[PDB]
């Protein structure tokens, strides 16, 4: 893993509406195949930078588990940011519709 | 800041009862002045290592705020570990003795 700060900056630019007009202008004379190939090439460049530079270089986060800890932290961040938020919303939904624990209720006795 | 792992290891040794017997044996023919001077010298050696090595060396945690962030993190760790624990206990105490918020109740009206 690397360039997390650059990734945050990329997301900020993407959410900026001025950049939406800039992308609208850049999309003139452009194809979906070209866009997809560009994105795939970017991702490959990132992973290839990792595969090459891990052989000789160590980041500030280097640890006896290596990049495994960074990838676990990425996963945990994603989980807590997205999935637990969705769980909160689903909890409030179920509690308003059936009551707390309403989705695990037993069938009506016959 | 530096050698946090060594400090954790020191605490572990201190809490070990075998080391209590070892210290009992080491205290033979020893003075309180000597012990105090030894501890003070150890602390001075730590802070002097910092003052010297910060001039030319950078740790893995180096950041645009320097050691200020490490010291803040030390403080926050101490706070959350000790003071908030004490607050929890005091909260349960007050809730059992007067009720929740019992220490901020108004005086009895005359």
């Amino acid at each position: 893993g690397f360039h997390f700060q650059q990734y945050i900056a990329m997301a900020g630019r993407a959410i900026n509406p001025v950049q939406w007009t800039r992308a609208w202008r850049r999309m003139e004379g452009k194809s979906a195949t070209e866009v997809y190939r560009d994105a795939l090439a970017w991702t490959n460049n990132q992973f290839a930078q990792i595969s090459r530079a891990s052989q000789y270089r160590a980041w500030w986060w280097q640890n006896p588990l290596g990049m495994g800890l960074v990838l676990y932290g990425t996963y945990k961040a994603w989980h807590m940011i997205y999935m637990v938020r969705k769980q909160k919303k689903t909890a409030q939904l179920v509690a308003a519709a059936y009551g707390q624990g309403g989705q695990w209720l037993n069938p009506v006795p016959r | 800041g530096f050698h946090f792992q060594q400090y954790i290891a020191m605490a572990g040794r201190a809490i070990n009862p075998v080391q209590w017997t070892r210290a009992w044996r080491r205290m033979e023919g020893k003075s309180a002045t000597e012990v105090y001077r030894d501890a003070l010298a150890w602390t001075n050696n730590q802070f002097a290592q910092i003052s010297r090595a910060s001039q030319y060396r950078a740790w893995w945690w180096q950041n645009p705020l320097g050691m200020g962030l490490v010291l803040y993190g030390t403080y926050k760790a101490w706070h959350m570990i000790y003071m908030v624990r004490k607050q929890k206990k005091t909260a349960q105490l007050v809730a059992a003795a007067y009720g929740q918020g019992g220490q901020w109740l108004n005086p009895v009206p005359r």
């Binding site: 290839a48 930078q49 595969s51 090459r52 052989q55 000789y56 160590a58 500030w60 280097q62 | 030319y56 060396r57 950078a58 740790w59 893995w60 180096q62």
Partner: peptide, 22 residues
């Protein structure tokens, strides 16, 4: 990226807890 170099030396590295300073 490709591993360039004319060297046959199998070289690995160990890391420290200090950062590179220029």
């Amino acid at each position: 990226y490709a591993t360039l170099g004319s060297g046959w030396s199998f070289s690995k590295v160990q890391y420290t807890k200090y950062r590179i300073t220029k």
